[PDB]
C-alpha cells in the first residue's frame, strides 16, 4: 500500500515504557490478526493447541 | 428420468425382426403388421412374458415419424484449452501466483445458484518455462480435484505436447513431476466428467464449468494471465444410459407404475435394453378421432429402439419393413 | 507532477507509485512501462 503511510501514532508498533535506564524508553512489536476484505468479508483467528 | 408426454408415450425394443408372428420366439422380436389396404398399423412384440401388440395406428392420422441415430444422443464432453495469453506474457512472470479458479455451476442442486469453486495455485520462478508452468498447474488442479477418493474428479485434466498435439496426457493426484517428462507442453485441457447414472433414480446429468482466471501484475496493471478457449470435444457419453431410463419410464404406461415402492411386495419388470449399448430410435406420433361430437384428438407416441452397429443396419431394416407394410416413406438415417 | 516518495528493493516489480531497485538497475513507471535508467 504505497498510497498510505502507517502512522505509529495509530498503530503504536513502538510505544513508551517506564524504566530506569532512560526516560525515553521504548518497546517495539506488533502482530496482524484480522483482514477485512471487501463486501463484509471478515476473517478472525482462533489458535488451537490441538493444531 | 421423467420425460414429458403428449397424453402418452410408449416404447418397444427391437432386438430382431422376424416378419411373422409365428417367428416370434425370443424376447425383443418384433414384426410390423399392416393390412393390404394400409388402413392400420401395429407392432407385435415378443415380451419376456409372451407376446403383446402395440396400439393400432390410423395411418391417415400420422403426424411425424423420424428415425434418429445414436450419435444425435451422445452428449459431447465440453473441453477447454487453458494457455498463457501472449498479449500479457508468453512466459510465466516470476514472483506472481498464477491462481486458476474452476467455477462449477450446476453443483449438487439443480440451479445455477448452487455454485462450487475449486482452485489451483502456482507461484512462478526464474527460468520457469511455459511447459513447466502448465505441468505444475495441472498437478495442483488434479491434487485438488481428484483428491476426493469417493467417485470421480469433477473434471478430467490433460496436457498436450507440441510433438503430438492430438495425444492427451492424463494428470491425476497420483501423477508425479517425474512422470511428466516432455518439455514442449502448450496447454492445459479441462474436460468434464460423466457423473454416475442409476436406472430410475440417478439420471444422466452433468456439471458445467468455466475456468475463471485471477489477476496478476504485469508491467503496471492487474491482468488475467490466461485464456480459456473451448476446443472441439473428443469424447461422447453414449446413448445406452439414456434409452434405458426411457424404457424404465415408458414401461409404466404398459406395466406397473409401482416399481419398488413396497419393495418385496412388488412386481419384477424385465427391461430389455442393455444400458451399456448404443441404440438408435424411431418415434411415431399419431392420434385418435371419434365418430360424432367426439372430434377431439388423443395424440400418442410409439417409440422403437434398435442397437446401432457402426452402420445403422438394425433400424434401416425395421424402417424398410414398416414402409413396405404401412405405405409410409420414413427416411433411413 | 507524478511525485514518487518511495523506493523498493525486490526482484519483482512493486506498485507503480514507487521506484524499483534490483541489483544494479532502478525503474520507474513511465509510459505504461518500467523504464530503466542508464
Q: What one-character-per-residue DSSP string does B65-91 give?
A: EEEE-SGGGSEE----EEEE-TTT-SS
User: Residues 2 to 21 of A: which have CB under 8 A from any C CB?
Assistant: 2-3
User: Which residues of chain C have a CB within 8 Å of the CB of B219?
Assistant: 13, 29, 32-34
Q: Within its chain, how far is the Cα of B267 from the centroid?
A: 30
Beta bridge partners of B76: B236
- CA distance to partner chain A, nearest, from residue C7 (Å): 10
Cβ atoms < 10 Å from Cβ of B308: 21
Backbone gaps in chain B, preceding residues (C–N over 2.5 A): none
Q: How far apart are CA B190 and CA B228, in angstroms?
A: 9
Q: CB–CB of B191/B75 below 8 Å?
A: no
Contact status, residue B252 vs residue B259, Cβ threshold 8 Å: yes
Chains near A (3 or more Cβ pairs under 8 Å): C
Distance from the C33 Cα atom to the nearest Cα atom in chain B, whole angstroms:
6
Cβ contact (<8 Å) for C32 and B220?
yes
CB B55 within 8 A of CB B203: no
Q: How far apart are CA B230 and CA B189, in angstroms?
A: 9
Chosen from C12, C17, C28, C30 to mutate, greatest number of chain B CBs within 10 A: C12
CB atoms C13 and B217 under 8 Å = yes
φ/ψ of B288, rounded to 5, equals: -125, 135
Q: Are strands B236-237 and B75-76 parallel, antiparallel or unpaired?
A: antiparallel
DSSP B106-144: S-SSSSSSS-EEEEE--B--TT--HHHHHHHHHHHHHHH
Q: Contact, B217 vs B99, CB < 8 A? A: no
Instruction: Give the C-alpha separation, B176 to B115, whole Å.
Output: 30
**Cell numbers for B48:** 419376456
CA distance B55 to B328: 17
Please tell me the distance in Å from B219's CA to the nearest CA on chain C.
6
Amino acid at each position: 500500500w504505497t498510497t498510505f503511510v502507517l502512522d505509529n501514532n495509530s498503530t503504536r508498533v513502538v510505544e513508551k515504557v517506564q524504566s530506569r535506564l532512560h526516560s525515553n524508553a521504548l518497546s517495539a512489536g506488533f502482530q496482524f490478526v484480522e483482514y477485512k476484505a471487501p463486501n463484509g468479508v471478515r476473517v478472525r483467528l482462533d489458535v488451537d493447541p490441538f493444531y | 428420468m421423467v420425460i414429458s408426454i403428449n397424453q402418452v408415450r410408449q416404447l418397444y425394443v427391437a432386438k430382431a425382426l422376424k416378419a411373422n408372428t409365428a417367428a416370434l420366439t425370443t424376447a425383443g422380436d418384433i414384426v410390423p403388421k399392416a393390412d393390404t389396404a394400409k388402413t392400420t398399423l401395429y407392432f407385435q412384440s415378443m415380451s419376456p412374458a409372451g407376446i403383446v401388440a402395440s396400439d393400432k395406428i390410423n395411418l391417415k392420422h400420422v403426424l411425424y415419424a423420424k428415425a434418429t441415430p445414436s450419435e444425435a444422443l451422445a452428449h459431447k464432453l465440453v473441453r477447454y484449452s487453458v494457455t498463457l495469453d501472449a498479449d500479457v506474457s508468453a512466459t510465466p512472470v516470476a514472483g506472481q501466483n498464477y491462481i486458476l479458479r474452476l467455477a462449477f455451476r450446476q453443483y449438487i442442486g439443480l440451479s445455477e445458484e448452487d455454485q462450487y469453486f475449486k482452485y489451483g495455485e502456482v507461484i512462478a520462478r526464474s527460468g520457469m518455462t511455459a511447459s513447466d508452468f502448465y505441468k505444475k498447474m495441472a498437478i495442483s488442479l488434479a491434487k485438488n480435484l481428484e483428491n476426493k477418493t469417493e467417485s470421480t474428479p469433477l473434471v478430467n485434466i490433460y496436457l498436450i505436447s507440441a510433438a503430438a498435439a492430438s495425444t492427451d496426457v492424463p494428470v491425476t493426484s497420483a501423477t508425479k513431476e517425474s512422470d511428466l517428462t516432455a518439455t514442449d507442453y502448450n496447454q492445459i485441457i479441462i474436460e468434464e466428467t460423466e457423473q454416475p447414472w442409476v436406472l430410475g433414480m440417478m439420471p444422466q446429468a452433468f456439471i458445467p464449468f468455466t475456468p475463471q482466471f485471477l489477476t496478476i501484475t504485469v508491467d503496471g496493471e492487474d491482468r488475467l494471465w490466461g485464456v480459456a478457449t473451448v476446443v472441439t470435444p473428443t469424447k461422447t457419453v453414449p446413448d445406452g444410459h439414456l434409452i434405458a431410463d426411457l424404457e424404465y419410464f415408458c414401461m409404466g404406461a404398459r406395466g406397473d407404475i409401482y416399481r419398488g415402492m413396497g419393495y418385496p411386495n412388488i412386481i419384477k419388470t424385465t427391461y430389455l435394453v442393455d444400458p451399456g449399448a448404443v441404440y438408435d430410435v424411431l418415434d411415431i406420433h399419431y392420434f385418435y378421432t371419434g365418430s360424432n361430437e367426439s372430434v377431439q384428438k388423443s395424440e400418442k407416441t410409439i417409440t422403437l429402439v434398435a442397437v446401432d452397429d457402426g452402420s445403422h443396419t438394425a433400424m434401416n431394416a425395421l424402417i424398410g419393413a414398416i414402409n413396405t407394410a404401412s405405405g409410409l416413406t420414413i427416411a433411413t438415417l | 507532477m507524478k511525485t514518487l516518495r518511495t523506493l523498493k528493493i525486490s526482484p519483482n516489480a512493486p506498485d507503480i507509485n514507487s521506484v524499483w531497485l534490483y541489483k544494479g538497475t532502478m525503474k520507474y513507471f513511465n509510459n505504461g512501462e518500467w523504464e530503466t535508467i542508464g
